[PDB]
């Protein structure tokens, strides 16, 4: 709560909204499906609380594959993904009961497992190789209240994407300790790095899965709140005993706005390539900037993402006495600069902060000085 | 699940939607300020949890009176009055724990007290006055795990609007017994008997309460999701304690769509009279329409409503020898004439059934004699 340095701009790397400088507004065919769906009138009524036929069927259409076989009814649709967590885990695990969260991972599991009575079990995300998982952890954090695992694909805060192995091992390890995979992937497709992307399901044979998702984070409408589960029963595991668990669960807050489903079967089918590509265009040169200048500043270690929209720097706590953690380091770095960074403890991993890349180059740029002109006083 | 007769045109009058037959929908104001909120691309990132700063501001100003004075902070913007409930609940009261329904009353309010971990005590309502409450029963009703005391008006299913002295007598209850008062008044303003309409707050001194409401049942965008928590904390038996445990909890689902909240300001502001006017005239005229043919029927007791959009006959168990139960009753109904009523069981309330009145009048009047059909042979 410091103040900045008022002799300073302040510059805020630590908020994920893309569209606060609007230099990453959506796609003006998806502001006007919107508009075509008002327009029309069709959409103002009650819906299902799992949402539109024609709403789920077109989605469920969007994220078909032989591997992965998508249906209209394995679609639920609901008000983002804080609810496409919140009812994928009241379904799959009662109070006292534990699921595999990430370290570090996004603090919302936390509020919501630990808020929903289940006590919560942290895996760990490897720094020195790509923040992949530790197999070590996972094979043996399990229990017999062990609900759940779960995945969070590209990673908020990591920066990271899974490569086209390290998933199936992953999905090895789920058949070995018999349980399902809530793959938080709201980050689908929001890769930019050589390497392609890979939905987490169409990699998977005998392992249950419920995929998370939405609008807010790849069209960039955040405050739109729409998301889908995503069911992906492989082996009957789950069936028809845990699909009614979700449409009964649903209908407590009975999921979006209606325009927004309306306007669903357009955004997917009439946004252009070229709306995509341009962002993680821009996505990829401002993490290399910002990789860069980081990785030459002395006492930082910057992770190298690969998709989503942030990346994690490690603080080198070997000739940087006077901060005794990322906390006091931020803080100090907030009030002396008026840099805004979001210190990793939140997701639960000390020593190190999070930087997020949606922010203008030439802000990325200043901000990264800024930085540097803070450790050649510190280090 | 019964079939219909095959033979003869389906009437739903149970359903709730006024935008099914497309006869109400809303005015084309509410439609553009959604376009021109679109259209700026102000409102597509994230908001407060609690709602945007001048939506909540606006919505604040839209409800204000000396007697019930509204200020910017103690209005929370949720994506419908499901929420305003849902929360509104979560905070006053824990497992274990008493609050007071209405009987009959919105099926919903048990849904959640029940799933939430409450345990419901059922007030009453009275047909042969108005379906005003029943002073013993309340009195005396409540508990050391009393938390709340729940009022609907005007009523679902009941049609009503109470009189400007029973709210006064509703709110002396209330001071004799230290309880708050979610007033769920999703149905503000939706009346056209002679008489005006009160807001239950504003006639308040001594009374914590804490008001539902939204677009869904006055601007007919049901499937929109945007309502509001009003507080009204008169007397400080709420304070900073109350308002955070909103705050926090508002954190869990983060509330409604921005486009709608966007476009709030200018819904309000812009819509004109001749849309309500226009409402409720057609409101009263079908109720009145629906209203006499029943009343006109033989076995069938139908309470006038003043407000919202139904009303409830009452079957004479005297002359139905055939049928047993309601239930049995609008379903031998449904499959002999084709007429979808609703039980009133489902409310609480056996031996009586609900008809809304926003179906088309040349509907309403073909739906009337069917049911005459029915009990000439019957009653």
């Not at 509020?111 to 720094?127: D, F, H, Q, R, W």
């Not at 190789?129 to 908020?156: F, G």
């Not at 357009?266 to 390539?273: A, D, E, K, N, V």
């Not at 740029?365 to 800024?370: I, K, Q, V």
């Amino acid at each position: 709560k410091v103040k900045p340095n008022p002799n300073k701009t302040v510059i805020s790397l630590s908020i994920g909204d893309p569209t606060v400088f609007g230099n990453l507004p959506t796609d003006p065919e998806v502001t006007q499906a919107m508009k075509d769906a008002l327009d029309s009138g069709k959409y103002n009524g009650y819906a299902p609380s799992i949402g539109y036929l024609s709403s789920r069927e077109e989605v469920a259409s969007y994220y078909h594959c032989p591997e992965a076989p998508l249906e209209a009814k394995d679609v639920i649709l609901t008000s983002g993904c804080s609810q496409a967590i919140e009812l994928c885990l009241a379904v799959l695990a009662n109070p006292g009961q534990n699921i595999l969260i990430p370290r570090p991972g996004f603090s919302l599991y936390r509020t919501l497992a630990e808020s929903m009575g289940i006590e919560v079990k942290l895996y760990n995300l490897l720094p020195e190789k790509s923040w992949e998982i530790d197999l070590k952890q996972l094979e043996s954090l399990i229990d017999e209240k062990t609900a759940c695992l779960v995945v969070n694909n590209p990673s908020n805060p990591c920066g990271s994407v899974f490569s086209k192995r390290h998933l199936q091992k992953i999905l090895a390890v789920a058949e070995r300790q018999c349980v399902p995979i809530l793959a938080d992937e709201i980050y689908g497709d929001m890769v930019f790095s050589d390497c392609k992307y890979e939905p987490m399901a169409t990699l998977s044979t005998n392992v249950p899965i419920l995929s998370c998702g939405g609008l807010a984070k790849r069209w960039l409408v955040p405050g739109w709140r729409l998301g889908w589960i995503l069911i992906h029963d492989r082996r009957d595991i789950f069936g028809n005993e845990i699909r009614d668990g979700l449409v009964k669960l649903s209908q407590r807050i009975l999921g979006p706005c209606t325009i927004v489903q309306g306007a669903l079967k357009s955004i997917l089918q009439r946004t252009p390539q070229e709306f995509y590509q341009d962002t993680l265009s821009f996505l990829k040169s401002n993490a290399d900037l910002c990789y860069g200048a980081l990785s030459a500043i002395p006492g930082l270690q910057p992770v190298r993402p690969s998709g989503a929209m942030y990346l994690m720097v490690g603080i080198e706590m070997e000739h940087f006495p006077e901060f005794e953690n990322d906390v006091e380091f931020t803080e100090r770095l907030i009030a002396e600069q008026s840099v805004h960074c979001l210190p990793a403890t939140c997701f639960e991993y000390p020593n190190f902060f999070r930087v997020v890349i949606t922010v203008p180059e030439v802000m990325m740029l200043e901000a990264c000085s800024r930085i540097q002109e803070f450790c050649e006083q510190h280090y």
